[PDB]
Amino acid sequence: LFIDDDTVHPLLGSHVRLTEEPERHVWQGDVGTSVLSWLSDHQVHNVAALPGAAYCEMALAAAAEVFGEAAEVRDITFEQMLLLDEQTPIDAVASIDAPGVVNFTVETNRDGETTRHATAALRAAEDDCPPPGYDITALLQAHPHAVNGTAMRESFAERGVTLGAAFGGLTTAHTAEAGAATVLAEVALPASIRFQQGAYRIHPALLDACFQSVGAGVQAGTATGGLLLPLGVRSLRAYGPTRNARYCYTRLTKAFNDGTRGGEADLDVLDQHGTVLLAVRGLRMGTGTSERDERDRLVSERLLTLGWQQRALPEVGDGEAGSWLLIDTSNAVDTPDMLASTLTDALKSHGPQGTECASLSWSVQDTPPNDQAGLEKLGSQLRGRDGVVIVYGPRVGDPDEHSLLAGREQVRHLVRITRELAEFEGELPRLFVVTRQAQIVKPHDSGERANLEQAGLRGLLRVISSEHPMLRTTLIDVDEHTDVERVAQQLLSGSEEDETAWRNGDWYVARLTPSPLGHEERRTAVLDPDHDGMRVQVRRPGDLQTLEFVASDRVPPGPGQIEVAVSMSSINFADVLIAFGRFPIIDDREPQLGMDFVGVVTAVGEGVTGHQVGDRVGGFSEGGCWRTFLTCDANLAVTLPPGLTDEQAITAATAHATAWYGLNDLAQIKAGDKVLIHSATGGVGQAAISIARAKGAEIFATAGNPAKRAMLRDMGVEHVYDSRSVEFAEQIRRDTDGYGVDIVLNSLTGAAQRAGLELLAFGGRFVEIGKADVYGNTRLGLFPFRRGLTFYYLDLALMSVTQPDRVRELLATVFKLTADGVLTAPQCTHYPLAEAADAIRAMSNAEHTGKLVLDVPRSGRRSVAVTPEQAPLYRRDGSYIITGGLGGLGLFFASKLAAAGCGRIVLTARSQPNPKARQTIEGLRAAGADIVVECGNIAEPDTADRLVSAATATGLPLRGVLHSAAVVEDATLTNITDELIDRDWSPKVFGSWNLHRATLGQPLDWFCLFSSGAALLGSPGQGAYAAANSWVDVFAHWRRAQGLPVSAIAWGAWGEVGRATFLAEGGEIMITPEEGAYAFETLVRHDRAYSGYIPILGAPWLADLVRRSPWGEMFASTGQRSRGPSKFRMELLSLPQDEWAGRLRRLLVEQASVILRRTIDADRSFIEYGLDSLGMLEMRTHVETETGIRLTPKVIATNNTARALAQYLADTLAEEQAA
Amino acid sequence: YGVDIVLNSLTGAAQRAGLELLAFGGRFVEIGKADVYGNTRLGLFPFRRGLTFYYLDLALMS
């Protein structure tokens, strides 16, 4: 036992006055957890990351260093936050840019690159007037109803970031009202850290705590979902050492018009009165990403879809001593129960011990006079004994009109059967329902004729078994390969799950799964490049393997715009940059693949001459040149001269164009002068070699590995060196008799190029293409310029954008110089366009030699192309119709379609719209969209015939269609009237099937329908609508197998605590149409058949959604746990008083062992173990926190033994409980 | 829009700011002396606009 033995600003780490031009202040330090162990508390997603407050103190300290006192920092903004390792290298620099103006940024170099994290201005000393003060007592009076600080800590922790312990303060959050725009809090550093106040202007923990005060907001529901992070503040005004800082005051400027965005609050601090030590202005707090990104994440996590899991029979043969009874309830078919008889034989025989299985058959209902027979035979008397099985036959059925009519009455007879079983009071064994190809299953074998009559049986099964937790129903799907013997073996036990299936010779299980949108599932179309607009693109930056084809759509020739079908295209060096996402994307140009093209004119504009349709033409264009059809300006393109083939033109021009430009216009080669080319093996290098050889000048060159240097000798150029090295310059010096070079073309960076300038002699000319060095601002030392140098940077794209005429003249010039043969093509290393990934590798990895060329097969072909997000959603040339559009969601859809300027909009209200709906429709009609109303009942087939004929008779083809019917009741199965069944089914089915058969010829770009979220389980009462909803999903599968697009969406409001959410926020939600409108727009561009757009994990509906069905794919908790008020005391008082002694004795022993760091004996004194006054204080404070008993040393002295102390505490608890 | 051509003899922040003032493809010609011998740490970043640099001395050219 011994001591461990373990002035500079901590975060800055060191200061240096780099007093060059411009003058720069530089700081270098470390902020890892090894030094700042306290900083480890600030962790988001259990990952230690410093808050943005850390930069603010860094900026304040830097400004104080450079600006002296009265320092201030303006418009600080945060980049991506820093992940705190044990040690982390952090660097900050402040530089003078204008007289009296200094800009300051921070960054962290890593693995040869760097990432900036905060930028701010250091202009300060604006005024001498101290900021005015204000009455703290008046604010405190005006702000009652303060919220406990630890509650805010829990709120932040559950939102993703836990603050640990070192981030104390913010004891209470005082507010004026429920809509108060200003709050204040009492803030102070923890005792363990309070000593650190002498090393900061503002302690980072205290500042972050002040930021945490914003979490109170106008309401506790401010930014109800997700976590917010600060993005910096407009201005920061430090005016006093916060050594004595006690309270902080805020002003929520209510920039959160949505209640979530920005915040833009102002923070002040004070002490005991209207002191103002630090002022914070315009805090970008309610932030984190774009609202579009927020909605994308919300719809990603708010969408659900059932999932099917293959597995062996889980509980096969585990049942024993049962007595089954199989009843066929589908004997309207001639022989449905023949397969069920084997199930009875397997159940009766394979079952161990005296296991048996009776067999029965019956029509589903046949006639009303033969009702209640099932109840008497099984449901009331012969059940109870272990085993009940219900079979509906191996029937398959083409969903025609006859099948639809049969299925409606079939589900009616289903509810008739189930009603009697529900009404029975006795216990019922778990049911075994048998159906063939009717359960909703994975797209595997999700074809045609899938017996939709039997498809809707799911929706009611978990309504009867929700009021009766017993008889837990399990769905099984039958097929020819299901091997019914195994099924009955599974039926012999009945494993606890709801849905099972058989799409091959193996067993399946089904449960709900989260539904994030996939990318390979996107809409496709078999397109012909001969006439269909097609383009290539990358799915995500940084992954070249994600190259994919996308329908580029036809592009008619605009004003003065030419249209060209590509014959060939090349690969620019910038392509790999955009391919890997490291392209200089700052300019927000969103570049694509291809700056160059060659081909034949497809179409001609009106403001264009010279060029004409059919001309051989090549040129440069943006928007990506790797597309079948392209429309751009004529001046960007030049007619190919005769003899000059497109193949040679595309592979030679661009590199030759750049080289000739640099060597003829920027520099001017004088025959015999000395020029050097970096990486001559490159296409541009070969082009420059050709230009120089044409110009008859002395040539030096360099390249990579000796293989890349071999062809250089093969083309017969001397002075060949290794580009990867830097010693080439002095080698040239001695190889040029000490005299330097005249012109130099560089593709290198860093020390390589600066040596190049050092090699330049007198009137040297320097031309650079390297994107990296110029964009990195790693400025070259300009001392060698004294020789009289000229520096040029070249970007053909920039000139093309700004001076199309000049680049056009250059292209014509190089075309002529290639036609006459004075210029040689670099290489003909062609590669397939569809396999451009390996070309990207070859250029990026540079393992290849020479110029890489393409091959463009997509002149005319046939393949499936993934449609983009540009896919048609609104069309002037399109008719649209909605059923139930008078509903709020339908009203929003109509409003957005009219605002979008769609062609025609038809509506149906199942007899006629209500007067208010008619008034809203006529008000919206002034927008010009053809809004028309169709009468009749969707349940009537001729009404749908009208919807396909007369609605189309408005004058446009019908493309967008949707159905939006719904039920308005949640009564249990016993109360269901046939009127409700008819109104739920007949409109739905007579819309779906009739519009499917009656709209085949129409373009029909999309088709969607509404659904209920509980359709997988049924509402506690509603079973009929759930059954109806769990019928369209298979119908969607059936229609997709047919081919036409179809989709379905379940609808659910924002009931995270039920109805109380809306009453707490706005009282009225109409099932969240605003976010649904976004999803509806996305869902139009989606082909997924069915999905549940329902909130999850937040609603009380989660509890039943995870226990009603014993299945689970998402954990029903986020790991956040609450703490009971005096946890041990309540559970202790639950026990009888005699137990209390030992029960609290165990806790006393644990606490004493924690304090003393050693084991103890309850009957022995703490003093003999080493307890002291500090230990006594610790133990009594813990006791107060747990049992709230004022333990005092004289009590401790009398009860120095843990047993006696526990007995005294038990007696005290008994006395106070008696009181 | 900025300027197209700059003939500069100033030093330090003056030329630095003026160099930014150049428009796309601008021409910068330098005639002063202090900066070139001072190895001034200017900013290579604005060269994105396709700038061109020229250091001038009649004596050396002669």
Automatic annotation (TrEMBL), chain B:
This is Multifunctional mycocerosic acid synthase membrane-associated MAS. It comes from Mycobacterium tuberculosis.
